[PDB]
Amino acid sequence: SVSKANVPKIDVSPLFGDDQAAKMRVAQQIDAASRDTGFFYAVNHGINVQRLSQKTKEFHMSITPEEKWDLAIRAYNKEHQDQVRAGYYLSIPGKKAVESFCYLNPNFTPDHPRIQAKTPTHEVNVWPDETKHPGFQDFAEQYYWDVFGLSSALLKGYALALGKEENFFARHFKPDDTLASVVLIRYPYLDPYPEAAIKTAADGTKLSFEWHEDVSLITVLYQSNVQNLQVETAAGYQDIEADDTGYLINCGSYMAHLTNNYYKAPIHRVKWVNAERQSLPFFVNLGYDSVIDPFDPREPNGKSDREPLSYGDYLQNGLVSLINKNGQT
Ligand SMILES: CC(C)[C@@H](OC(=O)[C@@H](NC(=O)CCC[C@H](N)C(=O)O)[C@H](C)S)C(=O)O
């Protein structure tokens, strides 16, 4: 009785180019997806996703408990009070299956102005010892900028999709100040699998993570080839099929806000599947002070009554709400 979501494959290559009509044809497909289930697969994206998953896997499999404490966010290590976002999110054997490593803008160094100002949501990345994980930090920083580039292209598509000039979003998405994050998630195979780590949905479905709207402008996701996501529709949840060649894209609640919900932030959840897999989201966030004026594409005059929201405030509120609603990851 569980149906399958329409998730179109959209060749995004024209968004890297200068054929403006081809870009508009991409934008149309993004609009259509965004008004249907709210997910699509970006294909012909130019990122080497074989190397992403390989390098990600070598990390997760070889990091030791000593290293995880050293890298732990403050939820797992009281000594790390400045690590709210960036660092290692530990599994808890017998209790919590998932583990992950989050990093932010590589330009956030001790000498970046937002770090010197101690602005909330900005942190300096923490990295493992290079000798224990050769090439990992180089890999992960390069990956950040690779998915940054793709994301920039995607945002040109969303802008044209909504009738705006192509830099409408992208002009607020900058290497110097973006709050965007990468999370390298491992979902393990475990036998026996810990019951505490499996939630039961209202509809009976076993889940690893409950329903939510993403805290982002857009989310740009690579996952390995194990079907697990579901999107909510009026007729209930639908399976999103896996594709470990493409990036799965969806809007986050900042897009829904600024478009007067014309592009919804789709509600989605993660089914429990007992299988080793990877989930590598990139959360496209803008700069702390970025503000886009809301508008309503449905209205001839485009006007919305919604307040402009500063991205940094939105992000602070959102990440806290996620934790409170769905737990500490
Ligand atoms: C495929 C999805 C649903 C993914 O879930 C997430 O990554 C979750 N995101 C977070 O926990 C926010 C992490 C933010 C990060 N620590 C930061 O500071 O930017 C969300 C509910 S989308 C998954 O579990 O596969």
Ligand SMILES: [Fe+2]
């Ligand atoms: Fe999500």
